[PDB]
Nucleic acid binder design. Structure first.
Lengths: 700, 167, 171
DNA sequence: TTTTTTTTTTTTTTTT
């Protein structure tokens, strides 16, 4: 028999009772689906976690979906409870979903997540066939739905339908009034007639679901649509995004018929159209709510489009690196280029809610117009299939990129960022979606010229990439940070490390003195230096923090199209559901390191000589940068270009890695008893793998 | 019940049968009194004409009594005491015009009419025993109860069980 | 009060590890147990100096509790359990019940030593006729049955009180 | 005592 069935029979007739199971045999996790925790008593002092998770264990005989007790949510937060792990259940309890007629829900009250399972069989049947239903929904609570395991803007599950194709509708007997006319007469007329518009901007999803509120699929997406008489902001309400979101895209002629015109929202701004001729309507807004007969939205095909209507054409503000160099800040633009680098999918905490996160990742889009790549801060645009599976050597096109500039720092910062109404599309060979635009044709011409010339731009994927480089002087660094939180204590650092969540990144500043720096030939005369101060105070340290370890996934690795899937999966966000690995995968140490140096280990003794720490120094600058003076100092972590070397062909005479390592060690030795201000980078790679890499050493 | 009767987080008590919820045989003489008892609340006051009889001195139209059914929650945390007011008569049980003894309506959906003599089936005492037995059968069976809630003015709200769907 | 006790709380029931002399003969040392028997001897209330403070003392006295399960009596080292009314006024021919008795054993000596000792959380209760506080336990019922059998058989166990009784015998 | 941010809302009259 199966441990699942044994436990179920053991605790089936004692609902909501904590019962240690008779026998504990490891079970295999196969999925972790997240959803909102609702219908629980929030009066409790430890406010219930905002979200709860369902774990789909398997026992070799049957696989059953379990509801993890929210008290254990920290395990999923730190990615300890992965997919395909050998967890052992120490406590179990039953629970009946009164909103449904089914069986008990095995509740995992206590667990001991272990190691990976060598036998991950997804062919096992489901003990409770209700669990194996086509629409994958949460165990508890009416018509509940699942959210993306990490962020709230990524569509996830099966409710997100993608089967809305154009339909031929005859417009005879239809009025299709102009948007300006509607703006004039939306406060008097009763039956708002039809509208023929074209989507010009599609924005990310917005999850406004709150606990203990009678809300069903609380999603809203903002669409800007334009006709021959202006443009308006169209908003899709809950229960409509699931059916239409994955299908609606920019450039689709829609026929909205039964809508609701409201006064518009003052806390949300309407993006300016690419073509200024389009008159902007700001006093009006169109709300699309799900209706009984699904006719409120119709995707009119292009073939039916008549020039007589003169519908506005989807334009684009495509920009090239050279042009971007001359564009003021906050000047929206579009970028088409070749992905020559992709970074980890890091996460940041929303400033509004402490339990929500943004998923972002840095990518160096590049073109033939300049020698520097577009640095784009790619936040999730509710396009997980493209965002998660993005790889170098791909023609990438984003839609709405706000320009961000900072000239105070000596390394002038010029990186683009994705806006709310942005979009991501991967292009293939000649411009697939945007061939007509001349800039796309020029980019394709450059691609062909490079291909026939035998030149290939260097490619990288993943790694430790703290793009924003701290300024050259601590005063300028602190000009933005508050005085009370500017610095921390070497002792308090431990809590900072222990507070981060999956891929949450943090930057802290610590006051101390470099005591001993050691060089670790990383890839496959003096490498260690010790300070007399260290030899004296090493025996009187209260707590010597040891975080000078570099993980294999923090080393950027040169991309290889053949191992594309493996390389991508080694740096994406943790998948929600297990998927068996094709054949055997290679070793993450089997790929060449895009870096060009070995990592050092820096020991810092606090100003009071009581506490110490061991950070790891991971410079990303090549010796050519040293020779041409593209680095503020040898103790920094980035060259000014903030980009990896391209087709390195000039290291024949330049000092080798060992010479640069000796220079770095000597520079560190120059700071013997000097109170320096280190800038550390704390990133938690999940599964209790927190990397603490040094960024900059601000000397007096 | 004896095991989980004391650990209940909440216990609803809606097992009251208000006197105006029992159908009552119509007497032509107290026409206005009965109609005003079973019609919508007047807007303006109208003084009563004499002393009308109490509603509890009129013969009921129901053969059986009424039970107090307790429905424990599936999680053994919340209990509700609904009331049961079966409309069916012994004749219905004799000719089998009731789906089950725990149903509040008969197949005819009409009170006994032009009925002269009913002694074939035991009166409205043994039928109560049969209903109690039917409830006893479902000792620990998960069932679904269809409650018919109706607000009878003031703070009087009636919660009367309609049907007990067995697995 | 017990009357207010509801069975749904499922409060734990006061159990007891009642033991008989024959069973105690097979119990390892430091194995706490409970004893119910008939007091067939009581010794002086001797005193011993606390090892912590030189000016404090322990009040203890040896008693030979006995039952019908064996021919040898429970030798119990009864230290004071903050029950002076019972400890001071203990007499033979009384059904005696202690609560937490640690077993003490010494096999090095030829006269194998097997005597129980009162622990910190121990307790003393004198019982009357049929088990007054602990009637329900089957061992108490067996002890009462033996008492009645002895009474109706005209047999009375010899009784003693006080005297010079250095229990622990030197090897 | 401490403690912040977010959106959600459907519908049968007028003619002068």
């Amino acid at each position: 028999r199966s441990w699942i069935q044994k436990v179920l029979e053991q605790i089936m007739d004692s609902p909501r009772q904590c019962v240690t199971p008779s026998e504990v045999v490891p079970v295999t996790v196969l999925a972790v689906q997240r959803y909102l925790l609702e219908d629980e008593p929030r009066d409790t002092v430890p406010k219930p976690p905002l979200y709860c998770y369902d774990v789909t264990i398997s026992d070799g005989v049957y696989q059953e979906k379990c509801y993890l007790d929210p008290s254990l949510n920290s395990l999923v937060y730190q990615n300890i409870l992965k997919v395909g792990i050998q967890m052992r259940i120490s406590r179990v309890s039953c629970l009946y979903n009164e909103k449904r007629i089914g069986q008990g829900i095995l509740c995992i009250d206590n667990v001991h997540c272990g190691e990976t399972s060598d036998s991950i069989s997804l062919e096992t049947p489901f003990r409770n066939r209700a669990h194996q239903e086509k629409p994958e929904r949460p165990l508890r609570g009416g018509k509940s739905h699942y959210l993306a395991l990490w962020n709230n803007e990524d569509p996830y599950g099966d409710i997100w339908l993608t089967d809305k194709q154009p339909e031929e509708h005859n417009f005879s007997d239809t009025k299709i009034i102009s948007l300006s006319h509607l703006e004039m007469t939306w406060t008097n007329r009763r039956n708002f007639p039809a509208l023929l518009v074209r989507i010009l901007h599609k924005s990310k999803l917005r999850y406004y679901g709150k606990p203990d509120k009678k809300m069903i699929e609380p999603y809203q997406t903002f669409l800007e649509v334009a006709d021959s008489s202006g443009t308006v902001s169209v908003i899709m309400w809950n229960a409509l995004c699931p059916e239409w979101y994955k299908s609606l895209r920019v450039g689709l002629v829609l026929l909205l018929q039964d809508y609701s015109v409201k006064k518009s929202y003052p806390f949300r701004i309407q993006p300016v159209p690419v073509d200024p001729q389009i008159k902007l309507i700001s006093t009006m807004e169109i709300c699309l709510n799900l209706r009984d007969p699904p006719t409120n939205i119709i995707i009119i095909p292009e073939k039916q489009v008549k020039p007589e209507w003169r519908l506005p054409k989807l334009n684009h503000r495509f920009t090239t690196r050279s042009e971007l160099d001359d564009m003021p800040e906050n000047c929206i633009c579009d970028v088409i280029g070749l992905l020559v680098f992709v970074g980890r999918v890091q996460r940041s905490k929303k400033k509004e809610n402490r339990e929500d996160f943004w998923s972002y990742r840095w990518i160096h889009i590049a073109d033939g117009t300049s020698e520097q790549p577009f640095i784009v801060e790619l936040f999730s645009t509710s396009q997980p299939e493209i965002f998660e599976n993005i790889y170098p050597m791909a023609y990438f096109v984003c839609t709405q990129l706000k320009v961000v500039r900072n000239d105070n720092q000596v390394p002038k910062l010029l990186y683009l960022t994705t806006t709310n109404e942005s979009g991501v599309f991967i292009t293939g060979h000649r411009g697939q979606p945007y061939t007509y635009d001349a800039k796309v044709k020029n980019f394709i011409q450059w691609i062909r010229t490079k291909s026939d010339s035998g030149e290939q731009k260097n490619m990288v994927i993943g790694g430790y990439y703290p793009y924003p480089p701290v300024p050259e002087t601590f005063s300028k660094y602190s000009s933005s940070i508050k005085v009370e939180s500017l610095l921390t204590a070497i002792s308090e650092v431990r809590k900072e490390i222990e507070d981060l969540q999956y891929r949450e990144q943090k930057r802290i500043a610590i006051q101390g003195i470099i005591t001993a720096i050691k060089y670790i030939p990383h890839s496959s005369i003096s490498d260690r230096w010790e300070s007399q101060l260290w030899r004296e105070k090493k025996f009187g340290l209260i707590d010597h923090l040891h975080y000078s370890r570099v993980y294999p996934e923090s080393i950027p690795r040169k991309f290889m199209f053949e191992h594309r899937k493996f390389l991508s999966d080694q740096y994406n966000s943790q998948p929600a559901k297990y998927v068996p690995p094709e054949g055997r995968p290679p070793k993450l140490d089997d790929f060449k390191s895009a870096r060009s140096l070995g990592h050092f280990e820096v020991t810092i003794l606090g100003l009071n000589h009581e506490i110490a720490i061991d950070v790891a120094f991971l410079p990303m600058y090549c010796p050519e940068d040293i020779r041409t003076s593209q680095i503020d100092t040898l103790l920094t972590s980035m060259n000014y270009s903030c980009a990896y070397p391209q087709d390195t062909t000039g290291n024949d005479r330049l000092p080798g890695p060992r010479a640069v390592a000796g220079d770095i060690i000597k520079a560190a030795t120059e700071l013997d008893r000097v109170h320096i201000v280190g800038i550390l980078d704390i990133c938690n790679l999940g599964n209790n793998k927190v990397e603490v890499y040094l960024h900059k050493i601000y000397s007096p």
